[model samples]
Target: KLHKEPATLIKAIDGDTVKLMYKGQPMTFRLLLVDTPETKHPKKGVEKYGPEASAFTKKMVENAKKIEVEFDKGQRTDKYGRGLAYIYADGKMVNEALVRQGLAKVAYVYKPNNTHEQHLRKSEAQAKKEKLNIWS
Candidate 1:
């Protein structure tokens, strides 16, 4: 069974991270199974598609009436200290949505926790075939 928490979204920190209130405490979450270009970097600055990717994520998550987080089975947090999980908004998988839209890429591939990897890969293929956004 997957463990979950109903989250109150605070804001989109960037493309791949969001701040939310989990258990009444503010926390940062890294979107599992996908990664978008970085919009905020200390040294490197914004990446090529970073701004567009961040806009996509922010619009989707901010407008969602409900947001829930599904934690990974094996590794729950990454080395960067952000919580790792899949996000659901309005009955849709937000992570997969980003992949399907070509605003994000399939990344951080791990075995046991990657339950949606196959679906994500398929979405990525479709995006690539259409030359959508980043795939373009």
Candidate 2:
């Protein structure tokens, strides 16, 4: 129930947000089902473990040989107009990687767009059990 689309990463804006070129058009994508610390929020400023989360996401996408965006069955954009999707780098789910690393928490659960929520929450629980990063 997900639509996989090819994309090229333009920039890792933060751990949960990115700029991508999808189908030859530039767009901003907000990682679905997870929320990382705030490294680039103007009002919130730098949050705990924010830099580490940003660095982790940057490293993954920048080093990837291929990138993709997967859209779920819900609404495609958030209130801010950023495209809502799961990111994939080199066949790895970047969203899940963030959760497993404790850089992000499974959140923003809304209808239909939650196809991968259970999968991500499993990673989150493991991270919490292991006391990694944010969980620490």
Candidate 3:
């Protein structure tokens, strides 16, 4: 049934949370490495298009769909045993897509990915020049 790797895209409860079905069981995902601006917290509050960010993330991963995961070294646990992964779908890099769309920040752990890094910087620069999220 799974084309590549079936994975039910879970929704983020807060700024960093999601539940997915894996291996005949429900598995929660805590995004690793990067952190999106606060979406909604008792104290932190919402950050820009926080709700949109959550919505965008939810659309990225689908249910019962085979997705891919690109893992780097030392990318096991986020000191919490949560599966730290850079999720991918339909050959599209979900992580990069978020940064490219200015929905998420380019967060690098250890070695920086210049390819996406450059794009992220460029996108941010444009966002700054045009005042995207901050401006309008």
Candidate 4:
């Protein structure tokens, strides 16, 4: 099972990463089960769809005054050391919103707490069906 906590969203770094103030400390969270276009790349440089995803995520996080995050009990962080979480804003799943809006893709599965993986896949399908963002 996953655990939940409240965090103030400090800022959005990109489509999938956000700066959060949790327990009076700063932390970086990587949204679970989704990947957006690379806004910055070490080698290939910024990708084509990157800017739109970043803009959408920034707006989503900023518009949400309250934020909560769900953490996977096991492997809470990815290999890159960013905390893995499912972020919620205004009682809605922000991670799922990105997929449903077609700004991101269902990706990067490491199990044991994939509570929303199935739901996210369905959301992604709907985005594709509607030809939103990346799907277009």
Best by lDDT: 2
Model 1 TM-score relative to the real fold: 0.93
* Candidate 3: tens digits of C-alpha lDDT, residues 1-136: 1123455655556434566555566666665444566676568688777887777776766532556655444544556556655666677766665655666665664553232456556666665566655335
lDDT of candidate 4 vs native? 0.86
Off-target runs (Cα >4 Å) in candidate 2 are none
lDDT tens string, model 2, 2-97?
A: 668899988889988999998898899999999899888878989998999999999999999999899999899999989999999999999999
Q: After superposition, how far is residue 62 of candidate 3 from its true place, in Å?
A: 3.8
At residue 30, candidate 1 shows an lDDT of 91
lDDT digits (tens) for residues 57-133 of candidate 1: 88889999999999978788889778899998887888898889888999968878888889999999999999999
- Where is the poorest 10-residue window by lDDT in model 4? 40-49
Question: Each candidate's TM vs. the true structure?
Answer: 0.93, 0.96, 0.66, 0.92
lDDT of 1: 0.88
Q: Give per-residue lDDT, candidate 2, residue 111.
A: 90
- Candidate lDDT scores, in order, read 0.88, 0.92, 0.58, 0.86
**lDDT of candidate 3 at residue 18, scale 0 to 100:** 62
* Runs of candidate 1 exceeding 4 Å displacement: none
TM-score of 2: 0.96
Best by the TM-score measure: 2
